[PDB]
C-alpha cells in the first residue's frame, strides 16, 4: 500500500538514470571519435571542431540529465509518498 | 487500489524519460560525427555545417523532451492520483 | 477495478512516448549526418540539401508525435477513467 | 472483469503506436540520408530525387499511421467497452 | 470469462499492427535509399528505378497490411466476442 | 476455461502475422535496394534484374503469408473453439 | 485442463510460423540482393545466377515451411486435444 | 497435471522449430549471396561454386531439421503423454 | 508435481535444440560464403578451400549436435522420469 | 511493507549503476580508438587530440556517474527507508 | 520438493548446452571464413593456415564442451537428485 | 520479510557487477585494437599511443569499478539488512 | 526449502557456463580470423602471429573457465546444500 | 526464509560470472585481432604490439574477474546466509 508507492518510486529512479545513458553514451563516442579523427586530418581546424563537438556533447548530455532530474524528483521531491 | 495508480505513474515516468533518450542519443552522435568530419574536410563551410547540425539536434532533442514532458505530467500534473 | 484502468493508462502513456522516439531518433541522425557531409562536399547545394532534410525530419518527427498524441489522450482525454 | 477490457485496450493502444514507429523511423532516415547525399553529388537531379523520396516517405509513414489508427480505434471507437 | 476474450483480442490487435511495421519499415528505407542514390548516379534511369522501387514498396507495404487486416478483424469482425 | 482457448487463439493470431513480417520486411528491402542500384549501373539489364527481383519478392512474401494463413485459420477456421 | 492443451497448442502454432520467417526472411534478401547485383555486373551470367539463387531460395523457404508444418500439425492433426 | 505435460510439449515443439531457423536462415543467405557474387565474377567456376554452396546449405539445413525432428518427436513420439 | 519433471524435460529439450543452431547457423554461412568467394577468386585452390571448409563445418555442426544429444537424452533416456 | 522499500531500493541501485556503463563503455572505446588512430596518422597533433579526447571522456564518464550517484543515494541517503 | 530439483536440473541442462554454442558458433565461422580466404590468396600457406585454424577451432569448441559437460553432469551425475 | 531484503541485495550485487562490464569490455577492445594498429603503422609513436590508450582504459575501467563498489556495498556495507 | 537451494544452484550452474562462452566465443573467432589472414599475407611471421594468438586465446578461454569453475562449485562444492 | 537468501545468492553468483565475460570476451578478440594483423604488416614491431596488447588484455580480464570475485563472495563469504 504505502510501501508500494515508495518501492515503485526507487525502481523508477534506477530505470530513469540507468536507461538514459545508453543512447547518449554511444552518440557522444561517435561524435568525439570523428572529432579527433578530424583534428588529426586538419590540425589547424581544432578550434572549429572542438567548438562544434562541445555544442553536440551538451545536447547529448542533456538527454541523460532529463533522466537524472526525474530520478532525483522521484527520490527527493516525490509528490505521492 | 489508490496506491496502484501512483505506483504505476512513477514507473511510467521512469520508462518515459529513460527509453526516450536511446534513439535521439545515437542519432545526435551520428549527425555530430559527420558534422566535425565535414568541418575538418571543408573548414570554410563550418557556419553552414554548424547551422544545419543545430537544426537537426533540435529536432532530435524534441523527441526526448516529449518523454520528459509526459514524465513531469505523471509526477506533478497527474490527473488520476 | 477503477484503479486498474488508470494504472494501465499511465503505463501505456509511458510506453507510447518512450518507444516512439527509438526509430525516428536513429533515422533523424542518419539523415542529418549525410546532410552536413553533403554540405561539406558541395557547399553551393546547402539550400537544396537543407530543404530535403527539413521535409525528411518533419516526416520522422510526426512518427514520434503520434506516440505523444496517444500518451496525452491516455492522460488528459481518457474515455475509460 | 469490466475494467480488464478497458485496461487491456489502453495497453494495446500504447504498444500499437509505440512499436509502429521503430521500423519506419530507421527507414525514413536511411532514405532521406541517401537523398541529400545524392543531391550533393548531382544537384541537377534534386527534383527527381525529392519526388522519389516523398513517394518513399509516404509508404513508410503509412506503416506507422496503421498503428495510430488502431490506437485511436481502441481509445475512441472501442467495440468491446 | 467474456471479458478475457475481448481483453486478449485488443492486445492481439495492438501487437499485430505494432510488430508488422518493424521489418517493412527498415526494408522500404533500404530500397528507397538505393533508389535515390541510383537516380543521382544515373538520372536518365529515373523511370526504370521508380518503377522497380514502386513494385518493391507495394510488396513490403502488403506485409504490414496483413497485420492491419488481422487487427481490424480482431476489433470489428471478431468471431469469438 | 472455455474462454481461455479463444483468448489464446487471438493472441496466437496477432503474434503469427506480427512476427512473420520482420525477416521478409528487411529481406525484400535488401533485394529491392541492390535491384535499383543494379538498374542505375546497367540500365539495359532492367528486364533481367526486375525478373529475378520479382521471383525473390514472391519467395519472401510467401514466408509472411504462412503467418497470415495461420492467423486467419486461428480466427475463422479454429478447430478447438 | 482440457482447455489448457488447446490454448498451449494455438500459442505454439503462432510462435512456430511467426519465428520461422525471421532468419530465412533476412537470408533470402541477402542472396537475392547479391544475385541482382551480379546480373547488373555480368548480364550474360543471368541463367547461372538465377539457377544458383533459386536452389538457395528453396533451401531457405524449407526452413520456414518446417515451422508451417508444425503449426498445421498443432491445429489440424493435434494428438493431445 | 496430465494436461501440463501435453501443454509443455506443444510449446516446446513450437519453440524448437521456430528458433532453429534463425541462425541457418541468416547463414544460408550469406553463403548463397557470396556464391552468386562469385558466379558473376567468375562464370566458368559455377560448377565448383554451386558444389561447395550445396554442401554448405545441407550442413546448415540439418541444423534446423534437428529442431523439426525434436518437435515431431514431442508431438508424435512423446514418451511422457 | 509428478508431471512437473516431464513438463520441464520437454521444455528443456525444445530450448536445447532450438538455441543450439543460432551460432553455428550464422557461423557456417560466414565460412561457406568466404569459401565460394575464394573459389571464384582462385578456382585452382577449390580442393584446399573445400577441405578446410568441411573441417570447419564439422566443428560447427558438432556444437548443435551437443544440443540434439541432450534433447534426445531428455526425451528418450530421461533418468528423472 | 518496510522490507519491500529496502528490497526495491537495492534492486534499483544495482540496475542504476549496471545499466549506466553500457553506452558510455562503448562510446569511450569509439572515441579513444579514433584518438590513437589520429595520433598514429599525425603524431604532432597528440596534444590537440588528447585534449579533445579527455573533454569527451569526461562528458561520457559523467553519464555513468549519474547512475552511481542515484545508486549511492538509494543505499546511503534513502528518504523512504 | 523432490520433483523441483529434477525439474530445475533438466531446464539447467537445456540452457547450459543451448546457450554455450551461440558465441563459439559465430566465432568458428569468422575464423574458418578468413582461413579459406587466406588459402585462396596464398595457397602455399595452406599448412600454416590449417594448423592455426585447427588450434583456434579447438579453443572455441572447448567453450561449448564446458556447457555439454555441465548438462551431462546435471542429467547423469546429479549430486542433489 | 527479513530474508527478502538480503535476497534482493545479492541479486542486485550480481546484476551490478555483471552488467557493468558489457560496455567497457567492448569499448576497451575497440581502443586497444586501434592502438596496436596505430603502433604497427607508426612504431615511433608507441609512447604517445600507449599514453592516450592507458588514460582511456582507466576511464573505461572506472565505469565497471562503480558496479563493483555498489555490489561490494550491497554485500559487506548493507545498511538495510 | 531444502529443494529450493539445490533447484536454484543447478539453474545458476547452467546460466554460469552457458552465458560465459558468448563473448569469448565471438572474441576467439575475431582473433583467430585476423591471425590466419595475417599468416596468408606474411607467411614468414607465422611464429610471431601464432605466439600472440595463443596468448590471446588463453586470456579469452580463462573468461569462460571462471564460469565453469563457479558451475562446478555450485554442483560439487555447494556450501548451502 | 533461510532458503530464499541462499537460492537468491547462487542465482546472483551464476549471473555475476556469466554476464561478466560478454563484453571483455568481444573486446579481447577485437584487440588481439588487430594485434596479429599489425604483426603481419610490421613484424619488427612485435615487441611494441605484444606489450600494448598484454596491458589491454589485463584491463579487460580484470572486468570479468570483478564478476568472479562477487560470485566467490556470494558462495564462500556470504554475510546473509
Ligand atoms: C523539473 C523538476 C525539478 C524538481 C525535481 C528535483 O530534481 O529536485 C529535487 C532536489 O534534488 C531535492 O529537493
Ligand atoms: C509486490 C511487488 C511489487 C513490485 C515492486 C514495486 C513496483 C515495481 C514494479 C516493477 C516491475 C518491473 C519493471 C519493468
Ligand atoms: C539543451 C542543450 C543546450 C546547449 C548549450 C550550448 C552550449 C554551448 C557550448 C559552446
Ligand atoms: C499489487 C502489486 C502489483 C505491482 C504493480 C504496480 C505497478 C505496475 C507496473 C508494471 C510494470 C510493467 C513494466 C512494463
Ligand atoms: C528549429 C531549430 C532551432 C535551432 C536553435 C539552435 C539552438 C542554439 C542553442 C545553443 C547555442 C550555442 C552556440 C554555439 C556557438 C559555437
Ligand atoms: C500537457 C503538458 C504537460 C506539462 C506538464 C509539465 C509540468 C511542469 C513541471 C515543472 C516542475 C515542477 C516542480 C514541482 C516541485 C514540487
Ligand atoms: C498488476 C498491475 C497491472 C495493471 C498496471 C499495468 C498493466 C500493464 C502490465 C503489462 C504491460 C506492459 C508489458 C510490457
Ligand atoms: C486483473 C489484473 C490484470 C491486468 C492486465 C491488464 C491487461 C494487460 C495485457 C497483458 C500484457 C500485454 C503486454 C505485452
Ligand atoms: C488476467 C490477465 C489477462 C490479461 C489480458 C489477456 C491477454 C494476455 C496476453 C499476454 C501475453 C502477450 C504476449 C507477450
Ligand atoms: C487466465 C490467463 C489468460 C492468459 C491469456 C491466454 C494467452 C496465453 C499467453 C500468451 C503468451 C505468448 C508469449 C509470451
Ligand atoms: C499458402 C499460399 C502461399 C503461396 C504464396 C505465393 C506467393 C505470393 C506472392 C506473389
Ligand atoms: C492458465 C494460464 C495459462 C494459459 C495460457 C496457455 C498456455 C501457453 C503458455 C505460453 C508460454 C509461451 C512463452 C514462450
Ligand atoms: C497450470 C498452468 C500453467 C501454464 C502451463 C504452461 C506450460 C508451458 C511453459 C512455457 C514456458 C517456456 C518459456 C520459454
Ligand atoms: C505448475 C507449474 C508451471 C510451470 C510448468 C513447467 C515450467 C517449466 C518452464 C519454465 C520456463 C523456462 C524458461 C527458460
Ligand atoms: C513481495 C514480493 C517481492 C518481490 C519484488 C521485490 C522488490 C521489487 C523489485 C522489482 C524489480 C523488477 C525490476 C525489473
Ligand atoms: C549530481 C551530479 C554530480 C556528478 C557530476 C560528475 C561530473 C564530473 C566529471 C567527471 C570527469 C572526471 C575527470 C575530469
Ligand atoms: C513450482 C513451479 C515452477 C517449476 C519450474 C522449474 C524451475 C525452473 C525455472 C527456471 C527459470 C527460468 C529462467 C532461466
Ligand atoms: C517472495 C519471493 C520472491 C523473491 C524476490 C527477491 C528479489 C527479486 C529481484 C527481482 C529482479 C528481477 C529483474 C531485475
Ligand atoms: C518454487 C519455484 C522456485 C523456482 C525454481 C528455482 C529458482 C530459480 C529462479 C530462476 C530465475 C532465473 C533468472 C532468469
Ligand atoms: C519461494 C520461491 C520464490 C522465488 C524466488 C527465487 C530466487 C530469487 C531469484 C530471482 C531471479 C530474478 C533474476 C532476473
Numbering used by the authors:
A (entry chain H), B (entry chain I), C (entry chain J), D (entry chain K), E (entry chain L), F (entry chain M), ...: 1 to 81
Published text:
ATP synthases convert energy of H+ electrochemical gradient across the membrane into energy of chemical bonds in ATP molecules by coupling of H+ transfer and ATP synthesis. All ATP synthases consist of two main parts, FO and F1. The most advanced are the studies of the c-ring which is a key part of the rotor. The proton flow passing between the ring and a-subunit2,8 drives rotation of the c-ring.
